[PDB]
Design a protein around this nucleic acid. Sequence first.
RNA 1: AUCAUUCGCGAGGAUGUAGUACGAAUGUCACUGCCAGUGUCGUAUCUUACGUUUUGAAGAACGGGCCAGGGAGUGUAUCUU
RNA 2: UCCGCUGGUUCCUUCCGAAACAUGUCGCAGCAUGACCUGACUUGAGAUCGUCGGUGGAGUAGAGCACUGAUUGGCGAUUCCGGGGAUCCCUCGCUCGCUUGUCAAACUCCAAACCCCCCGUCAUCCUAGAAAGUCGGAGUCCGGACUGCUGGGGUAAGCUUGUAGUCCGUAAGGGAGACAACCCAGCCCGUGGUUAAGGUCCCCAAGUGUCGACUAAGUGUUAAUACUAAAGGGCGU
RNA 3: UGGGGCCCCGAAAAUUGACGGGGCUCAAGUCGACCACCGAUACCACGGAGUACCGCAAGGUAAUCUCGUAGGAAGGCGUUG
RNA 4: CCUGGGGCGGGACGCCCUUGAAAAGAUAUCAAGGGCGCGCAAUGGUUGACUCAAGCGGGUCGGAAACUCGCUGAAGAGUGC
RNA 5: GCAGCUUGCUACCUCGAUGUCGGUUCUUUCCAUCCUGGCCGUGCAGCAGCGGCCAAGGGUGAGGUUGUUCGCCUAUUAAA
Lengths: 96, 57, 159, 153
Amino acid sequence: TNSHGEKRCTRYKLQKTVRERGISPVSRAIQEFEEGQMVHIDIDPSVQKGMPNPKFQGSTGKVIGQRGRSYVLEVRSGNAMKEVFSLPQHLKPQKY
Amino acid sequence: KSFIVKGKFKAGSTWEKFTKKIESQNEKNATDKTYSIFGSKHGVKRSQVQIESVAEE
Amino acid sequence: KPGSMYRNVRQRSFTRRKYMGGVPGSQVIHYDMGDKANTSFPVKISLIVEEKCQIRHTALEAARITANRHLVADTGKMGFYMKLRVYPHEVIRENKSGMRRAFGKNVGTAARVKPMQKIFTVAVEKQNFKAAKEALWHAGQKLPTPCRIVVDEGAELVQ
Amino acid sequence: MYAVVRLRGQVNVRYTIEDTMKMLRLHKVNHCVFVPENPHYKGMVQKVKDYVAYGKIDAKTLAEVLENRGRLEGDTRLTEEYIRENTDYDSIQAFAEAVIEGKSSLKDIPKLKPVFRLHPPRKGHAGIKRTVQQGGVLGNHDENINVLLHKMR
RNA sequence: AUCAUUCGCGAGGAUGUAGUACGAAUGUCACUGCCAGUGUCGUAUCUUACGUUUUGAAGAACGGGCCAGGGAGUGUAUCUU
RNA sequence: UCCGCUGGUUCCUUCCGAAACAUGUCGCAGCAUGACCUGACUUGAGAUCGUCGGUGGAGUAGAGCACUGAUUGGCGAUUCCGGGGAUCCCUCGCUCGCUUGUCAAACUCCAAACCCCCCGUCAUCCUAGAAAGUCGGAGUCCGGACUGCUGGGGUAAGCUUGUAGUCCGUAAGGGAGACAACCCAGCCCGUGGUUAAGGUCCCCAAGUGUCGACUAAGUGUUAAUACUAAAGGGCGU
RNA sequence: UGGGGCCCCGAAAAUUGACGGGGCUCAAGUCGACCACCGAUACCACGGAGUACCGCAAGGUAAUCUCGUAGGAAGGCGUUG
RNA sequence: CCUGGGGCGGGACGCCCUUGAAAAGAUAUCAAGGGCGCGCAAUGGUUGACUCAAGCGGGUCGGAAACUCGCUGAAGAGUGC
RNA sequence: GCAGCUUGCUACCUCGAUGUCGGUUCUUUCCAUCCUGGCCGUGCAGCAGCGGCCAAGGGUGAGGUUGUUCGCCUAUUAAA
Ligand SMILES: [K+]
Ligand SMILES: [K+]
Ligand SMILES: [Mg+2]
Ligand SMILES: [Mg+2]
Ligand SMILES: [Mg+2]
Ligand SMILES: [Mg+2]
Ligand SMILES: [Mg+2]
Ligand SMILES: [Mg+2]
Ligand SMILES: [Mg+2]
Ligand SMILES: [Mg+2]
Ligand SMILES: [Mg+2]
């Protein structure tokens, strides 16, 4: 029957394009975000640690704090506000 | 009062040219009669008939 | 089992044979007839279906047989070239109980063709255009769709 | 300036199109609003093209609509005396010409309602099951909105 | 409305007459001896009972021949508001 | 006695008004919790049903063969692995390429339109109380339909099971002969007017209307439609 | 020869029956267009009722108030003491 | 208990992946492909050093089956299932 | 493709009951015609066939087995 794992229906969500497979650019892992900054969640499949749920892939979160290397984001999911923890490898600043 | 109307109309899957000769009161009546004739003879709407020109014969 | 059963296209494709089991082999033997090593045939007519349908491998084989017989009889053994363009890739299945676990078993293959898609192409000399036309007309009688013949090359060579 | 007149009612309409109608203040058939030509209102009008007729309105039609169907709070009828008291323009034709030219606003009439509740079209309209380009009445009338607005006075 | 002018191949349209004559109603002045209401019948339009079970009841689903009367959220304890 | 099962449960108006769904359940004709309805209070400034522009998510349609697999010949080579009757005396199927012809739910070098998060903008709502919170009372967890998604399954089904919108359920009135859910339309009472859908030969209010053609079969006089016959053929027109 | 419109053949069912019926043939059918009219409780106008919110009151506002099953909420009528 | 009545069959009765599923999320069926109820003191951690599959050419009965050299080789290997 | 006369599929109606199969009796309808009427073709000499078209006015029976429907068999029959 059909399962209920985290990696449910993640074949293309957690896949890389052909010419971006391998070691990702390391600059994305050492980016810093200020409190209240809006960042996109674009999960890097090669970085298997600190990865939020794929359900939050494609969402913009607001940075509300830091929990070590990872950032705490307030991410809207339907009508709820979820606290999502993410390494900066999966994050990306919003550009205005 | 005989006119010459040229254009193309959609005959099923393929467009078709025509150079039909028409007798009418004036140029715009000739255009109207061309549209009516092709709607009657082929069931095509006026959007499916493109009249390139109407010239007094 | 009439061709009207597996004729209409209401479904997605079913072609990945590694996720299915036991497909009966197709009946269509050859796909190139006549003189296969000739390309300087000036006239080239094709048979295009005009509806979206599925053609079973047996219907394709029947049409191919009838057209090939007519061409070989009229133009000779090497007076023509004939190509069956489409391969039966779809797997047809049937539910052979009632509606419980009704996902069918594979019973054959069909080609899912679109409107205005070429099924058969025939290349002949100028003098054999009407014979090729007649042969393709007979072939289309065996197919589950209305068809029409079109001249692809050498239109000015016939009229 | 867009003239937006609602010609189809509210039963069986998607909530997004109906909410667009409500944001245009078009709650009922034969109701008309006048909105500027910016892309925001253009997209909003494009959203409801299957339930309204719209187009560019001229000063004469705006003048007749203001005189015949302009209303104030409490359902009072707009008149020339109120226009001259509360605006720098002598009459309603001059005010409408200013509004069309963009040098004045319908919000520059105190207590004026933004909705003009129009009469049904005299001698009927072209039909609400086809667009203007199909011989119907729905959609973009361009400058020919004034014909329909004239027959709804 | 009618008529005049003009446009239209035509059925017709536009302009003027005319926002006029009229027009729900609101007043006012005369005239009149009825009117409201009720019963029955007729003409016109509309509606296939009611309650229930039902996605769906006019159902060939269940209930009632009729009428009268009787006939169904109450008390103690306790918790919450 | 008990039952989650059946039947009944008595006055009026006014305000608002669902759910026939998810998870758990010896659960499947039940119940709980939540979504959804309703009432009250607290709080005190924003909110987002819609548009436009932008920062981001795309891997569906379509397309294509670059990966995974299928698939059709022609042409050139693997002096390689092998089918045919002592110098393996010579015949050649697959395999690998260049052209041809086809494909894919569980293929993708590509790649929309919808849509989603966020920012700005207009728009609308909002101190006559946004968003948020707390508490009281529930019903509901038999649904059904239309229009799409070639939705999935099925020979198909007025079949079965999904999904988006909208309806019936609980929706009058007007119109389709009648029509739960099709069209107009959401509807306080009365009067007048003008329209909508639809119609205008009679039944039946309004055209025996206009222009230009077609049909000779009473074909037809049938928006959607569960209420409408095909392939094939015709020197009928 | 190809592409088109309409029609014909292909075309057989059970009580007598269905373009709604009558009937209809340069149409009262079909196709392309058009003109005028009829036709709702829609829309407009007037008058009236209720409702929501505001207002000390008087009253003000309502295009953005007025359908409704389960159901919640408010105010009333009646019976006996 | 589920169940295209029930029963027989089966388990879609717990967990995990792909498709279905309509490019956010959600999404049913006795829908399709299936898998798991484990194994491993190394088949684990870290550091260093290396680079895999498969072809082509060279090398002695070391055969076109071993081992070794060179070239190509972003992965066509391996990573327990 | 038609029909819905076989068997399935389905679960829309009916479980506060729409009395089962077969036969019998009586009435009726359909036509896809077995005979009877009219035709056309023939690889139709005649006789008699075979194939097809129109046509539903009339007829289409009696018996043995079997509950049978169906079917088998018997002797008549224009046909049964
Ligand atoms: K490929
Ligand atoms: K069943
Ligand atoms: Mg009593
Ligand atoms: Mg319950
Ligand atoms: Mg595709
Ligand atoms: Mg609807
Ligand atoms: Mg109910
Ligand atoms: Mg409703
Ligand atoms: Mg109604
Ligand atoms: Mg109620
Ligand atoms: Mg059971």
